Amino acid sequence: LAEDPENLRWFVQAELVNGRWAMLGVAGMLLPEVFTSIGIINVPKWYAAGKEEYFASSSTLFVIEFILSHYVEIRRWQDIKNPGSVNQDPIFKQYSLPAGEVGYPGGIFNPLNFAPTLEAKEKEIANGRLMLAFLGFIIQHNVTGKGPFDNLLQHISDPWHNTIVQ
Amino acid sequence: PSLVISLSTGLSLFLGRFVFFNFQRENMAKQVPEQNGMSHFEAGDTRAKEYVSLLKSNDPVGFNIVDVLAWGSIGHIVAYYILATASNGYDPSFF
Amino acid sequence: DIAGLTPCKESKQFAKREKQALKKLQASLKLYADDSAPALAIKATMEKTKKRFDNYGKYGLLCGSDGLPHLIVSGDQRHWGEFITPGILFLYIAGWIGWVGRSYLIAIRDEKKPTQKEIIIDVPLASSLLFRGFSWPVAAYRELLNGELVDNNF
Amino acid sequence: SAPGDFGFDPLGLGEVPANLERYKESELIHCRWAMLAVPGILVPEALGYGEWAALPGGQATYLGNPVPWGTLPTILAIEFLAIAFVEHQRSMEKDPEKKKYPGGAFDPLGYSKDPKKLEELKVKEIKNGRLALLAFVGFCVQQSAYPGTGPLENLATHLADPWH
Ligand code: CLA
Ligand SMILES: CC(=CC=C/C(C)=C/C=C/C=C(C)/C=C/C=C(C)/C=C/C1=C(C)CCCC1(C)C)/C=C/C1=C(C)CCCC1(C)C
Ligand SMILES: CC1=C(/C=C/C(C)=C/C=C/C(C)=C\C=C\C=C(C)\C=C\C=C(C)\C=C\C2=C(C)CCCC2(C)C)C(C)(C)CCC1
Ligand SMILES: CCCCCCCCCCCCO[C@H]1O[C@H](CO)[C@@H](O[C@H]2O[C@H](CO)[C@@H](O)[C@H](O)[C@H]2O)[C@H](O)[C@H]1O
């Protein structure tokens, strides 16, 4: 009691993983936009290697990878109850040892730290969201569309479309 | 198809594990201990139990099964008879 | 598809319902509105239950005998959001009724004499603890089971 | 996840520290008998040429109608009486000194003992034990579902998803 927070560990690490995976997610799109032509779901497969065999299937693929992702992920667990990850640049950041002016508890607002040379996990702050909410954006607009920006002939001006579905 | 006598073989597997002790030490019923008349009183109540007495013939009369159950079941029960048959007797192999 | 029959794409019994029944609705050869501007069976009430033609959307929707439509919702063939879609919805809405129940409540028992502040209402609906509910991402799904309402307080 | 760290003593530990896994040593040697069974293929390439297969006429038919019917009941019935030999002996022990139900021997120093037959070191039986258990229970279900067929791989990939 515990007046108030708290937390900590917690879901600040909560974010960064959103941040830095929403960032990647959008590398996803990056591709089909300059020398353009090729994407949406495009339910890839996803880049697809050689002419020496697959063939629709050989295998669930997809389904596996992430059995792997799976114990590597127990590993990041395998970190955050009890701080273990050499670099140590998510759990507070690196700059070895430190930040944990919030690892033993007592925050309220606590801003943080972590580049030796140099600066921060900060203006990696705000690419941090630009991209989470971007996705929000990204697989917002499909559910009707899939492409950006030509010139001033007759595109960027929104002409006629078709509700929501309804 | 059914081993019917697969299992009646089987059940007096166990109650001959019954033929037991009417014979061997002393009287009946480890003599009526407690039956009629009525326990001390006892009283909560009450005893006894003993995780420690599942031996005695585990080994010996675990044969009892194979008795009747062998030669006296599927192999035509006592062929070695005769012993007063004329008001009749026999008896005669339904098998 | 399952125990009853198939949807709307065909459902004979269902069809007959459309038709007699409503349309008898009709039933009134006239009954006067040759041009007249009130008596609205005429327009919709039928057509709003009616132009609901061989379309209702299309919804799958199973329809047994007499062809009144039955709800499976076992998450299969088509029928999933006849419980879950409007199920999580019932959950999310409530719980953000009582998340705030356990809120324009756990905000009082303190300061000075707090003995019925509640027969009047301090912030109406709470209008402060209000959005705490949509401003539940995760929320009680962690902080209920860890800390605050913490087993301690259990 | 049953060995997800949990257990105290006579129940918790006591039941298992070697005891149950020392009884799970049997499991492994059963799966040494069973992995003395499966190796019928076990190897590619050698003959059988051609062992009790699909019931043609048992051991030697007997001079008289076979007791019940089938090879199964005659070889079976016995197995579960002639092996109760071992478990009788295996369930009469105690770990420290052996006398009867003697005076008083609970704990000073030396602390009781350890599974009677402990690790005695060689913590390598267990490293192979759960290795075997994990197999028997595990991808042994590669051959525990719909294995009406046998060995005939023909080039493609690997795996097949959820099915059937
Ligand atoms: C905010 C409120 C609140 C909350 C979180 C609960 C929670 C609970 N009630 Mg409950 N209850 C309430 C108000 C509330 N009640 C009221 C006002 C009454 C009328 C006396 C009851 C009568 C009642 C009974 C008879 C039972 C419960 C039971 C329960 C428990 C079972 C849930 C259930 O299925 O009943 C569903 C909930 C109701 C029937 C309550 C109806 C009232 C709701 C709609 C309150 C809505 C908020 C209200 C307008 C407050 C104003 C907001 C303010 C911040 C400005 C659960 C702990 C059961 C129990 O004890 O088992 C654990 C038991 O059967 N309640
Ligand atoms: C949100 C909601 C709601 C509601 C509603 C509600 C939420 C209602 C409730 C109500 C309540 C009540 C009504 C209560 C009552 C109470 C009582 C009745 C009590 C009684 C008593 C007591 C008090 C105790 C004991 C005694 C007696 C018994 C007397 C939902 C919505 C929806 C819909 C439409 C449908 C679909 C889904 C959704 C979309 C989601
Ligand atoms: C899938 C599905 C299913 C399943 C089911 C089941 C299995 C159930 C059970 C269930 C259960 C088992 C439940 C329970 C739980 C537990 C608990 C424990 C809960 C809770 C809680 C709480 C406590 C809450 C609270 C609250 C909230 C959150 C809101 C506000 C405040 C209050 C109070 C209200 C069903 C059937 C539906 C049908 C089909 C679908
Ligand atoms: C991150 C979210 C919070 C996570 C906190 C960690 C707690 C998670 C619970 C794990 C404790 C497991 O305990 C509980 O497992 C299952 C029931 O819950 C059941 O058990 C089941 O899996 C157990 C492994 O643990 C084994 O018993 C068997 O696999 C199966 O029976 C038991 O009923 C119970 O012992």
From Swiss-Prot, chain A:
Binding site residues for chlorophyll a 1: 15, 129
One cellular component term from this protein's GO annotations in UniProt: photosystem II
Residues where chlorophyll b 2 binds: 20, 63
Binding site for chlorophyll a 5: 123, 140
PTM section of the record: Photoregulated by reversible phosphorylation of its threonine residues.
A molecular function GO annotation: metal ion binding
UniProt-annotated location(s): Plastid, Chloroplast thylakoid membrane
Membrane topology: Multi-pass membrane protein
UniProt entry keywords in alphabetical sequence: Chlorophyll, Chloroplast, Chromophore, Magnesium, Membrane, Metal-binding, Phosphoprotein, Photosynthesis, Photosystem I, Photosystem II, Plastid, Thylakoid, Transit peptide, Transmembrane, Transmembrane helix
Chain segments annotated as coiled-coil in the UniProt record: none
Residues that, per the record, bind chlorophyll a 6: 155
Regulation: induction: Down-regulated by UV-B.
GO biological process, one term: photosynthesis, light harvesting
Binding site for chlorophyll b 4: 76
Keyword Transit peptide annotated: yes
Stated role: The light-harvesting complex (LHC) functions as a light receptor, it captures and delivers excitation energy to photosystems with which it is closely associated.
Notes on the domains: The N-terminus of the protein extends into the stroma where it is involved with adhesion of granal membranes and post-translational modifications; both are believed to mediate the distribution of excitation energy between photosystems I and II.
Subunit structure: The LHC complex consists of chlorophyll a-b binding proteins.
Protein name: Chlorophyll a-b binding protein P4, chloroplastic
Organism from which the protein derives: Pisum sativum
Gene: lhcA-P4
Curated annotation (Swiss-Prot), chain B:
Keyword entries, A-Z: Chloroplast, Membrane, Photosynthesis, Photosystem I, Plastid, Thylakoid, Transit peptide, Transmembrane, Transmembrane helix
Predominant cellular place of this UniProt entry's protein: plastid
GO BP annotations, alphabetical order: photosynthesis
Membrane protein topology class: Multi-pass membrane protein
Job description of the protein: Not yet known.
Chain ranges passing through the membrane: 3-23, 65-85
Subcellular location: Plastid, Chloroplast thylakoid membrane
Name the UniProt record assigns to this protein: Photosystem I reaction center subunit V, chloroplastic
Whole-protein coverage range: 73 to 167 of 167
GO cellular component, as recorded: chloroplast thylakoid membrane; photosystem I
Family: Belongs to the PsaG/PsaK family.
Domain of life: Eukaryota
UniProtKB/Swiss-Prot annotation, chain C:
Main location: plastid
Keywords: Chloroplast, Photosynthesis, Photosystem I, Plastid, Thylakoid, Transit peptide
The keyword ATP-binding is assigned to this record: no
Gene Ontology MF annotations: phosphoprotein binding
Source superkingdom: Eukaryota
Keyword Amino-acid biosynthesis: no
Family: Belongs to the PsaF family.
Role according to the record: Probably participates in efficiency of electron transfer from plastocyanin to P700 (or cytochrome c553 in algae and cyanobacteria). This plastocyanin-docking protein contributes to the specific association of plastocyanin to PSI.
Protein name: Photosystem I reaction center subunit III, chloroplastic
UniProt organism field: Spinacia oleracea
Encoding gene, per UniProt annotation: PSAF
Stretch of the intact protein here: 78 to 231 of 231
Curated annotation (Swiss-Prot), chain D:
Transmembrane segments: 33-50, 66-86, 131-151
Protein keywords: Chlorophyll, Chloroplast, Chromophore, Magnesium, Membrane, Metal-binding, Phosphoprotein, Photosynthesis, Photosystem I, Plastid, Thylakoid, Transit peptide, Transmembrane, Transmembrane helix
UniProt induction comment: Induced by low light (LL) but repressed by high light (HL). Inhibited by cold.
Residues annotated as binding chlorophyll a 5: 124, 142
Binding site for chlorophyll a 2: 30
Subunit and partners: The LHC complex consists of chlorophyll a-b binding proteins. Red-emitting heterodimer with LHCA4. Interacts with LHCA5.
Protein name as catalogued: Chlorophyll a-b binding protein 6, chloroplastic
Organism, as annotated: Arabidopsis thaliana (Mouse-ear cress)
Entire protein: shown range: 61 to 230 of 241
